[PDB]
Design a protein around this ligand. Sequence first.
Ligand code: HEM
Ligand code: HEM
Ligand SMILES: Cc1cc(N)nc(CCCN2CCC(F)(F)CC2)c1
Ligand SMILES: Cc1cc(N)nc(CCCN2CCC(F)(F)CC2)c1
Ligand SMILES: C[C@H](O)[C@H](O)[C@H]1CNc2nc(N)[nH]c(=O)c2N1
Ligand SMILES: C[C@H](O)[C@H](O)[C@H]1CNc2nc(N)[nH]c(=O)c2N1
Ligand SMILES: [Cl-]
Ligand SMILES: [Cl-]
Ligand SMILES: [Gd]
Ligand SMILES: [Gd]
Ligand SMILES: [Gd]
Ligand SMILES: [Zn+2]
Lengths: 401, 401
Amino acid sequence: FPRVKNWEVGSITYDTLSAQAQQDGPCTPRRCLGSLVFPAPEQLLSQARDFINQYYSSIKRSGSQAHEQRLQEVEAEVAATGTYQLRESELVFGAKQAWRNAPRCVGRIQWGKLQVFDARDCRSAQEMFTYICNHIKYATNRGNLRSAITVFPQRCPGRGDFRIWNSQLVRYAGYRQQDGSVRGDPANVEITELCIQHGWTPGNGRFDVLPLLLQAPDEPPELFLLPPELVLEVPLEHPTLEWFAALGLRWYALPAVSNMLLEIGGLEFPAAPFSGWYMSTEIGTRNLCDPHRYNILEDVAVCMDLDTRTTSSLWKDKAAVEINVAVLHSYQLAKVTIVDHHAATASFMKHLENEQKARGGCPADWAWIVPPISGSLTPVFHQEMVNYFLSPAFRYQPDPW
Amino acid sequence: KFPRVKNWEVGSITYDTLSAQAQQDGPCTPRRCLGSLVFPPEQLLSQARDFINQYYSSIKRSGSQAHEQRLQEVEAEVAATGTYQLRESELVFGAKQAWRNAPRCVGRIQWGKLQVFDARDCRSAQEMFTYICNHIKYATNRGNLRSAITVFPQRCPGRGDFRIWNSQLVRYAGYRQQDGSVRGDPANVEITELCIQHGWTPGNGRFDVLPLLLQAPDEPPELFLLPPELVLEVPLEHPTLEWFAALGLRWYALPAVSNMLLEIGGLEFPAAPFSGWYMSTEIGTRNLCDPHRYNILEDVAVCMDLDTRTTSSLWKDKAAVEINVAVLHSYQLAKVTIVDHHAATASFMKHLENEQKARGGCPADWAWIVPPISGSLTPVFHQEMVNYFLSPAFRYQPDPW
Ligand code: HEM
Ligand code: HEM
Ligand SMILES: Cc1cc(N)nc(CCCN2CCC(F)(F)CC2)c1
Ligand SMILES: Cc1cc(N)nc(CCCN2CCC(F)(F)CC2)c1
Ligand SMILES: C[C@H](O)[C@H](O)[C@H]1CNc2nc(N)[nH]c(=O)c2N1
Ligand SMILES: C[C@H](O)[C@H](O)[C@H]1CNc2nc(N)[nH]c(=O)c2N1
Ligand SMILES: [Cl-]
Ligand SMILES: [Cl-]
Ligand SMILES: [Gd]
Ligand SMILES: [Gd]
Ligand SMILES: [Gd]
Ligand SMILES: [Zn+2]
């Protein structure tokens, strides 16, 4: 069992949970690939058997009558149909475990507080849209954000998948330009071209909210415009730099990942969007300052009168700190939930302590947990971590096009 | 079987073919990644053949007379004596290769410019001290720092080893109190207690340079006071915060690592101190701001009148940036070589590109190359990396007690 040290306090623990890691990751004793972003009834049964045992452990009925009955039931359903169906409470527990098991999420202190919307009876792309609008409405909640997931029908033999082609429910268009550049968010060029190709009349702003491309089984995707009043946004201003409002910057309130696959007990839900609330560095450091995103860093530094001709002036660091200040201030002013990287990493440390007690460890991807500014100023920098895959899980999947 | 490696800022793809050589298998398995953990008889001929083969390929002289001749002599020496001695140029070439192979070193663009002092004919702690003293004054060079390594005698069976008991040649004292807490550097409270225990009269200050504990084989160590005119230090002041000088902070000029074991061609040199120059985050972010180091962060924030009452004022980030500015400014005004983390990481990206052509890859430890502040503002953050062990190498080793 791996020995794990916290270097700020000196404390030492052993990750016994890691020995139960089912699926394999990309590293070998030859080489570590930790920094890479993207590294049969019999196997369905054993996956399902393990999830069911997990579920009956959580409700304190391990080995009970109801426990054996459900195993027997699942094997009989897989025999007669090649698949099986989750009970509603198994689905709720499975969605919470998937979040709990997500190594790259620093927000997991919250994992038990998750609203699960059961959309498995969903019948079309049009009904899919209504479920999604209600998800956004519930989760936004006028700025007091609530964590939620909506679960659409599972992958099953004989029919195609429900898919949300958008990587998030709320995304800004990215328009390739006259002179080869991008207007808007360069991360979203591909889906933007798909929306236009599928009938959308583009705008030409930098913060144009994209429509949804929704795929019902064995159907082309269908375009759905989001109602403007369902998309809460936050104009960005700085508490002391008044010229900052003149940049015209904005971000949206709700982070809602919609392109990941939810796997529970061998069943696969390729459409199961989920949302929480932002950590300020995602917006201020990554989305605004990444050279391949909005890339505003030098424009802000010039405005601040910083000496941008030498790196040793630390102009990049100084400009990025004020951009993050502006994000926090703007979301607090608008009364939209947001967490700063110090509060979030501090709460993640409590999660590791709760999880060491509860499960004997906790899967964590160090490079993703440590924030992209001020890393060693946060307690997670000084914490060794063990990264591995547990199921139930959120998995990546290829884009449907 | 050749890891695909992407850079996310540009979109470029490379393949690390060099990874196919990895010797000392690392800590990761397909089941769990341990990339974030700090510290995770005639086999000698195998590593000797391989190193000699390395040497001759690097001089474009493989498979030609001088190559075969050197192969037989190492055979004859190990057959007769059970070990072998390295030719001068081989020792020079191996020291540079060990630097070049260090996955945690961001400064390897400099790997080809290294001064090797051959101290293999040494005997006793008095000879070490004059060797170490020659290194220090050469490397310091009145602040125009020059990378250097001094190679003390190799290890042989039956007889003890040369060891420098200090982790660095310049370290500051750490003294406990009437209450456990430490005045000075808490990273060195152990070796401070050993220095006091071995006859040294401790100071009171927060920046007292410790004496050296040098150990010749099979003999107890001996304390050595370092010549004060040879320990070049830099008082810390800020360009515009006139009170920063009053905090009385200093750091020394020469980062000289004296606890790592140099290993070339199966031979092991437990005393081989190497040095270069500091990246400024090492001093200003880790040494001065780490909670378990000098921990000065809040004291600077109080002086800057920052609001330490809520983490979302980003007061830690602001004070950290200004501490780093003061380090760069102070070293520049003292005319002592230093490199900021933007300049350093940009040169490392160049080093990666050089090494892709020269060797088809580069072992790099992402969590150690990315700087501890402003990580995603530097290019290395957006570069996927592959970590693995090549030989020759610098390796960690147990404390000599
Ligand atoms: C409640 C507030 C939450 C916070 C503050 C938070 C925080 C974060 C952050 C900072 C990341 C890294 C994202 C990136 O750099 O792209 C992340 C990733 C992730 N989060 Fe959370 N999260 C929250 C809610 C949730 C919820 C409700 C779920 C699922 C039910 C979830 C599941 C995940 C997953 C699967 C990832 C991995 C994304 C990827 O690998 O690309 N999170 N989270
Ligand atoms: C000349 C300029 C140099 C710069 C800017 C530089 C920079 C760095 C930095 C920032 C680290 C991280 C260490 C830490 O965070 O504690 C490091 C590690 C390391 N460097 Fe370099 N270094 C330089 C010279 C050298 C030289 C001359 C050697 C050997 C001949 C070397 C070998 C190593 C090794 C073995 C490590 C790993 C240290 C450890 O694991 O604690 N470096 N370097
Ligand atoms: C729920 C949630 C909360 C939060 N605060 N932040 C996020 C950002 C996730 C971004 N992540 C990028 C890669 C991907 F697209 F593949 C999957 C999503 C999500
Ligand atoms: C050569 C060099 C250059 C540089 N710029 N910085 C360093 C810092 C290395 C610090 N490292 C700490 C852990 C250890 F003690 F084990 C070994 C030394 C070294
Ligand atoms: C290549 C590198 O792994 C990549 O840039 C990662 C690093 N860590 C990250 N961490 C988070 N939270 N989000 C990210 O997108 C990334 N990107
Ligand atoms: C636990 C974690 O691996 C540890 O704090 C590491 C992270 N990255 C680092 N990177 C460098 N350069 N130096 C360090 O000491 C560390 N510490
Ligand atoms: Cl985002
Ligand atoms: Cl140091
Ligand atoms: Gd102002
Ligand atoms: Gd402008
Ligand atoms: Gd004052
Ligand atoms: Zn690994």
